[PDB]
With several copies, the nearest count.
Chain A
Amino acid sequence: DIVLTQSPASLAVSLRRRATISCRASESVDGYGHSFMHWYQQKSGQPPKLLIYRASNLESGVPARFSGSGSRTDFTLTIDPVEADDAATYYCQQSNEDPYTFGSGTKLEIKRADAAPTVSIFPPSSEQLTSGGASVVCFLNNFYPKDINVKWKIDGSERQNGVLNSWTDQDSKDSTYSMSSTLTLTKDEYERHNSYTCEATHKTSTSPIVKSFNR
Chain B
Amino acid sequence: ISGWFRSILSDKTSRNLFFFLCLNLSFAFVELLYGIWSNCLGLISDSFHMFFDSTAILAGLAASVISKWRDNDAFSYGYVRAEVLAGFVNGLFLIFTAFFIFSEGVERALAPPLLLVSILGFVVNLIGIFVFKHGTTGPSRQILQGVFLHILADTLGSIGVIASAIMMQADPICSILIAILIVVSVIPLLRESVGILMQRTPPLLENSLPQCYQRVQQLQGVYSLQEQHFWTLCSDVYVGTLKLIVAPDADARWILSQTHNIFTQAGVRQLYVQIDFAAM
Contacts and interface: CB of A to CB of B under 8 A. Distances in A.
Determine whether A and B are in direct contact in the complex, meaning some CB atoms lie less than 8 angstroms apart.
yes
Interface string B52-72: 000000000000000000000
A44 B279 CA distance: 35
Contacts of B260: 32
Nearest to A31: B257
Contacts of A32: 253, 256-257, 260, 276
B219 to A, nearest CB: 8
B251 interface: yes
Interface string B247-259: 0000101101110
Contacts of B257: 31-32, 34
A96 B220 contact: no
B261 interface: yes
Interface string B31-65: 00000000000000000000000000000000000
A95 interface: yes
Contacts of A96: 254
A39 interface: no
B258 A31 contact: yes
Interface residues of B, number: 13
Interface string B227-257: 0000000000000000000000001011011
A36 B261 CA distance: 15
Contact of A31 (B218, B220, B254, B280): B254
Interface string A27-53: 000011110100000000000000000
A98 B220 contact: yes
A95 B250 CA distance: 12
B261 A31 contact: yes
Contacts of B256: 31-32
A32 to B, nearest CB: 5
Interface in A83-115: 95-96, 98
Contact of B279 (A34, A95, A98): A34
Contacts of B258: 31
A95 B251 contact: yes
Nearest to A33: B279
A36 B277 CA distance: 14
A56 B253 CA distance: 15
Interface string B266-279: 00000000001001
Contacts of A31: 253-254, 256-258, 261
A96 B256 CA distance: 12
Contacts of A33: 279
A210 to B, nearest CB: 61
Contacts of B261: 31
Interface string B139-162: 000000000000000000000000
Contacts of A34: 253-254, 257, 279
Interface in B103-124: none
Contacts of B279: 33-34
Given A32-B257, A34-B279, 20 more contacts: A31-B253, A31-B254, A31-B256, A31-B257, A31-B258, A31-B261, A32-B253, A32-B256, A32-B260, A32-B276, A33-B279, A34-B253, A34-B254, A34-B257, A36-B253, A36-B254, A56-B280, A95-B251, A96-B254, A98-B218
15 contacts: A31-B254, A31-B257, A31-B261, A32-B256, A32-B257, A34-B253, A34-B254, A34-B257, A34-B279, A36-B253, A36-B254, A95-B251, A95-B254, A98-B218, A98-B220
